[PDB]
Amino acid sequence: MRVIIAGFGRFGQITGRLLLSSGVKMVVLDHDPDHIETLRKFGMKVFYGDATRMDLLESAGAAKAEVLINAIDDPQTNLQLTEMVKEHFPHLQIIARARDVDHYIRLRQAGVEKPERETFEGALKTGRLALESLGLGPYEARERADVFRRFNIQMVEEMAMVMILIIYAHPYPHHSHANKRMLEQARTLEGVEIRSLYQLYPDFNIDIAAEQEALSRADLIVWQHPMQWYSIPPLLKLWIDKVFSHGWAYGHGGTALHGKHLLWAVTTGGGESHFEIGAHPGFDVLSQPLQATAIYCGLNWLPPFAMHCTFICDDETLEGQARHYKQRLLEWQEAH
Amino acid sequence: MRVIIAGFGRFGQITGRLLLSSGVKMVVLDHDPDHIETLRKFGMKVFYGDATRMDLLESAGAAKAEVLINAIDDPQTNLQLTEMVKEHFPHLQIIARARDVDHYIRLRQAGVEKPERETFEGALKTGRLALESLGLGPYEARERADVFRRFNIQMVEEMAMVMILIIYAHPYPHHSHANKRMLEQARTLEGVEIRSLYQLYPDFNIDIAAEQEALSRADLIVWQHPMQWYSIPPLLKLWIDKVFSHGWAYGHGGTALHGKHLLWAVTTGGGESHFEIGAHPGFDVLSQPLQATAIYCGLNWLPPFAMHCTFICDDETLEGQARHYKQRLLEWQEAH
Numbered sequence: 001m002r003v004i005i006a007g008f009g010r011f012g013q014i015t016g017r018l019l020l021s022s023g024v025k026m027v028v029l030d031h032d033p034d035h036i037e038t039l040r041k042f043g044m045k046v047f048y049g050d051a052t053r054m055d056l057l058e059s060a061g062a063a064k065a066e067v068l069i070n071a072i073d074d075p076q077t078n079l080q081l082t083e084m085v086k087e088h089f090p091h092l093q094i095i096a097r098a099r100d101v102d103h104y105i106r107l108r109q110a111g112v113e114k115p116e117r118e119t120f121e122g123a124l125k126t127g128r129l130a131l132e133s134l135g136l137g138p139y140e141a142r143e144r145a146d147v148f149r150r151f152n153i154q155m156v157e158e159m160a161m162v163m164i165l166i167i168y169a170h171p172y173p174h175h176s177h178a179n180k181r182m183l184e185q186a187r188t189l190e191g192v193e194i195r196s197l198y199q200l201y202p203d204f205n206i207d208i209a210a211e212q213e214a215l216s217r218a219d220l221i222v223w224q225h226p227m228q229w230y231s232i233p234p235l236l237k238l239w240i241d242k243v244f245s246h247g248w249a250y251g252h253g254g255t256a257l258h259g260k261h262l263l264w265a266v267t268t269g270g271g272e273s274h275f276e277i278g279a280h281p282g283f284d285v286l287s288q289p290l291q292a293t294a295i296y297c298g299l300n301w302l303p304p305f306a307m308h309c310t311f312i313c314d315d316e317t318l319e320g321q322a323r324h325y326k327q328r329l330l331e332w333q334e335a336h
Numbered sequence: 337m338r339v340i341i342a343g344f345g346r347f348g349q350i351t352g353r354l355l356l357s358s359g360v361k362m363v364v365l366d367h368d369p370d371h372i373e374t375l376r377k378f379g380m381k382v383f384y385g386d387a388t389r390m391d392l393l394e395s396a397g398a399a400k401a402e403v404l405i406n407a408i409d410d411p412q413t414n415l416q417l418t419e420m421v422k423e424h425f426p427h428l429q430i431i432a433r434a435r436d437v438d439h440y441i442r443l444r445q446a447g448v449e450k451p452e453r454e455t456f457e458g459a460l461k462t463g464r465l466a467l468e469s470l471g472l473g474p475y476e477a478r479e480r481a482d483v484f485r486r487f488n489i490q491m492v493e494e495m496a497m498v499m500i501l502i503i504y505a506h507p508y509p510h511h512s513h514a515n516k517r518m519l520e521q522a523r524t525l526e527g528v529e530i531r532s533l534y535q536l537y538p539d540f541n542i543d544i545a546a547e548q549e550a551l552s553r554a555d556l557i558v559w560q561h562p563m564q565w566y567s568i569p570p571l572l573k574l575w576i577d578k579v580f581s582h583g584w585a586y587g588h589g590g591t592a593l594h595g596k597h598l599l600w601a602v603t604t605g606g607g608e609s610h611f612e613i614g615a616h617p618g619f620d621v622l623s624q625p626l627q628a629t630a631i632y633c634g635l636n637w638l639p640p641f642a643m644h645c646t647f648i649c650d651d652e653t654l655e656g657q658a659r660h661y662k663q664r665l666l667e668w669q670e671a672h
């Protein structure tokens with residue numbers, strides 16, 4: 001229906017099995033009598049022949065499909081398919097396997113956004129296993145692989161070619177009601193940049209230098225998120241831990257944030273009264289770790305923006321609250 | 337000095353390049369004239385020939401090496417090398433590339449602990465890009481891949497055969513001084529289980545069922561960690577967000593934690609004066625998000641154990657605090 005997979009070897013099988021687990025229906029283009037049994041069990045419609053055939057492509061539903069996964073092993077065949085689909089089926093999104101760097105480059109030049117070098121991530125994993133058996137902790141080792149990946153991707157992309165900042169930290173931005181409205185409203189302003197952490201770093205691999213650059217340009221920084229267990233989401237905590245670095249956000253020479261302002265914009269399921277609990281009751285006390293973090297780094301902490309009772313929230317209330325968020329924002333701009 | 341890499345093609349080049357960035361000393365076994373220049377450029381010592389020659393293995397220093405990375409592509413040659421090494425060099429840890437499920441199985445049977453199927457992680461990434469191109473959030477997609485990975489590994493492992501609970505959340509357990517001593521002390525008690533989050537889940541993919549089972553068996557739960565930015569590490573917060581689930585920890589029928597105790601055991605680099613910051617100063621205030629979480633889940637909140645001044649801490653002070661932690665734990669179990 002929405003998905004076509006070309007090639008059902010080792011690579012296509014795992015990609016297909018992951019989609020099938022997530023409830024996605026697909027058809028397969030394959031031409032290996034060896035895969036007949038695998039295909040039988042897999043239980044999807046099969047088009048048996050060369051994927052480069054226009055007739056098989058059309059009968060597979062290419063003119064209506066959203067995504068083609070090009071899992072073809074042979075670079076020449078893999079590229080020929082890519083070129084055919086680009087020419088004949090302009091709305092069909094190509095996700096491609098690449099054999100190696102030369103193949104990756106040719107795919108990039110054919111307009112595939114992020115071709116996946118078939119052994120790359122396996123090889124990085126193997127590197128981490130070696131690091132761990134040499135005595136490195138698994139997390140430090142994964143971080144080292146993350147740094148190398150970013151570097152390597154930047155190098156191969158070069159070979160191929162050859163003021164408000166909202167730090168948004170909802171884990172499921174597509175599923176958001178309250179925060180999503182707040183952001184729609186904020187974008188109607190100017191000099192607003194939005195960085196959605198769970199969209200940028202689903203693998204919890206923050207690019208510190210990219211984050212520091214954006215902060216450098218901002219006058220007001222906003223930490224916007226749904227409250228989770230009286231606190232913030234894991235990825236926002238990671239962002240603080242990584243981005244607010246020694247010699248940059250604090251410590252000797254760490255003055256990059258001095259003079260800037262910070263707003264906490266948080267949504268909660270409960271209402272004010274729910275926070276009257278424990279030794280230090282009241283919603284305002286929960287701002288403490290954040291305010292302490294901001295102050296330590298030389299930021300000016302603003303009165304938080306807080307939207308309560310999203311659990312029982314009227315759509316009329318969701319709107320007025322979102323517009324007051326924009327209003328807080330506008331008012332800060334006019335003062336600065 | 338420490339590592340031998342057999343095979344320096346696409347796969348072996350990435351693995352060895354990663355290790356170079358970590359300053360690891362390695363020698364290479366490779367027979368491909370096309371790789372000679374690459375190897376010379378990195379300054380790499382090469383033993384040219386079949387990695388399956390005993391005399392080459394010996395010359396490469398296999399009798400002293402800590403780790404062999406078997407990056408050979410050909411499954412037969414790859415397996416021959418594995419079995420030869422296992423027979424003759426008993427202290428040499430083998431990290432091996434696997435072509436597919438069958439190769440993976442034969443490596444397991446040869447005594448390789450975690451063979452890495454070469455295209456597996458690459459395919460999962462391709463599957464994630466397809467899901468995202470269909471409109472799924474990048475983070476939700478990654479989470480689907482994590483579930484798929486966990487299930488797949490368990491399946492391939494099947495085929496290959498054919499009370500105190502400390503939740504420890506130091507991001508760098510090996511680099512620790514204060515927490516390491518505390519865990520040394522705690523371990524001298526009876527009925528202690530330690531789960532080290534950053535060792536168990538470097539890729540931040542928590543196994544909720546396993547954590548919940550461990551919690552089932554605990555009477556005292558301890559959150560133990562160094563304090564970072566007035567709060568807790570990113571992985572502990574994920575652990576809370578994931579493991580303290582609707583219908584288990586809270587909400588209708590969520591009574592699994594009722595009657596259990598929770599202790600916060602935290603180390604800080606600053607003393608008490610460090611926490612004279614913000615509108616709600618004082619160290620005790622910082623426990624509020626955690627105490628509120630405890631209360632909502634029916635956990636019994638105990639007075640925290642806090643070790644301060646680790647930045648300026650004498651070694652006798654460190655020992656003494658590690659003994660006092662053991663003491664708190666002991667008196668708890670003597671009281672229950």
Ligand SMILES: Cc1cc2nc3c(=O)[nH]c(=O)nc-3n(C[C@H](O)[C@H](O)[C@H](O)COP(=O)(O)O)c2cc1C
Pocket residue numbers: 170175176177178179180225226227228229230231267268269270271310577
């Ligand atoms: C993991 C989890 C923990 C939560 N913890 C709290 C809580 O501490 N206090 C509270 O009021 N709401 C809590 N909530 C409710 C969310 O804050 C609320 O659903 C959210 O702000 C709604 O905004 P949204 O429509 O943008 O998702 C929690 C929700 C989840 C999913």
Ligand SMILES: Cc1cc2nc3c(=O)[nH]c(=O)nc-3n(C[C@H](O)[C@H](O)[C@H](O)COP(=O)(O)O)c2cc1C
Pocket residue numbers: 241506511512513514515516561562563564565566567603604605606607610646647
């Ligand atoms: C990311 C980062 C943030 C930190 N923030 C704080 C802070 O909030 N307050 C504090 O007293 N110490 C802070 N520290 C210092 C650690 O708490 C301290 O080094 C640790 O408790 C020592 O424990 P260890 O020897 O087991 O590593 C921070 C350290 C790091 C790495």
Ligand SMILES: CCN1C(=O)C[C@H](SC[C@H](NC(=O)CC[C@H](N)C(=O)O)C(=O)NCC(=O)O)C1=O
Pocket residue numbers: 009010011013014037038041435436437438453456
């Ligand atoms: C269990 C479900 N199922 C079936 O019904 C039959 C296939 S069998 C396992 C598969 N093997 C091959 O494709 C053989 C490749 C080869 N011989 C080659 O050298 O190229 C494979 O490894 N796939 C990637 C993975 O799983 O890691 C399958 O996946």
Ligand SMILES: [Zn+2]
Pocket residue numbers: 171172173174175472473474476
């Ligand atoms: Zn989403």
Ligand SMILES: [Zn+2]
Pocket residue numbers: 136137138140507508509510511
């Ligand atoms: Zn470590």
